[PDB]
Amino acid sequence: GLPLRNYDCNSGVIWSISINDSQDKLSVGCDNGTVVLIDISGGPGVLEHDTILMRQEARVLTLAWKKDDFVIGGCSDGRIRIWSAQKNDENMGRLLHTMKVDKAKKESTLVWSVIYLPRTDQIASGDSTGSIKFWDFQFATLNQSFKAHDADVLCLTTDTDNNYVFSAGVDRKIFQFSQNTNKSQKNNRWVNSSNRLLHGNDIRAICAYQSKGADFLVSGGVEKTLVINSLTSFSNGNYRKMPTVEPYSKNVLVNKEQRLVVSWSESTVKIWTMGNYKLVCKLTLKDDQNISTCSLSPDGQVLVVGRPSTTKVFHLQPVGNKLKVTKLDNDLLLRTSTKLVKFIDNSKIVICSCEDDVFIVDLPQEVELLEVTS
Amino acid sequence: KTKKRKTLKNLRKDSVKRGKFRVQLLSTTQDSKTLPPKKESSIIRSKDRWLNRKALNKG
């Protein structure tokens, strides 16, 4: 759960990231209008600078790939751009075509999302005007234009067969564009089949998955919750709204002795006492890394705050219906990563490191662990 | 009050002006590796300003 590798793109701030079909190169869109190809075929943890595509002045807000030959990018000047990423070709790294979407009169036009549709050899694009446009790839020409959304279209996705195109954005609606009918397929015409209002706020991310036993259309956004639909039965199928918080990892503990409630969020620990509740103490920690876990001794005097980077121990003393905090110094804990931590008694603790090393500290006695067959 | 905040700010300062030379501190290698680099406020702010622009009338 730590950064294996931090690789600098050698360009402006990144806006979009995408991977090609063979999964050997990353295309990275930058603020300065540059697109950088990063080779990742070397191995895990290996990233290398491959090539920089021809430069332009508009921010590249989104990227897509046609196999491993072309890079399709939507820009902040209201234009869709196709670069050639074909190696062993004279046109390598060159801007083959430029396409301009209809521009808002009184506002800037941003092409937020672009995807490639292999079956129909088309590009689907959503812009800040709410329009979805289908472009012919070989000629780089507009085939259809739909004024579907009332606000920005932030994300696009398609099914496996490219029979359905799903769009979502600020207007909280998900639109389905269908080309399933044989007559539609022969004519190559999309139809605005239906739309659904499922989110209480903006939809920033949408993705689709299909297998012999799975059919998911997963969306999420500013509401901070997932919404799950079925691609094939999107119009009529049931949907599930996942809980905003599912506490698989607990951010709150309660101490039976002293009747204390302790919650930690974003490097900040608050302690409450209930007889009807009073905030006895608040702890502000310096490190940017968030608190992974906190453990309080059965007596409640010793509080241990564990982070992947470091582990810090604080002693709590009740004074004047408030807690006095003093940081006990333990170099081993400061240099120790803490994935899980639990108290044996008021003094002894068991700590599991991020590398799966279980050892006991008295306030290290390593504990043998059975090997696991790979 | 505000001085306590400014004194807190002065501690969290990784450069100092020694005349024409500005000495700057180098952070620990573990800090860079353990956690990804910070976001640039200007870039992310521009997107969020756009999505909450006046013309949307989100209210």
């Binding site: 905030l279 006895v280 103490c281 608040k282 702890l283 502000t284 920690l285 310096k286 408030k322 807690l323 905090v325 940081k327 | 807190l8 501690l11 969290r12």
Partner: peptide, 14 residues
């Protein structure tokens, strides 16, 4: 809550 507030860096400074 400033009465009960605790800051680690201020403690570290003094």
């Amino acid at each position: 809550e400033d009465d009960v507030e605790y800051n680690e860096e201020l403690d570290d400074a003094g």
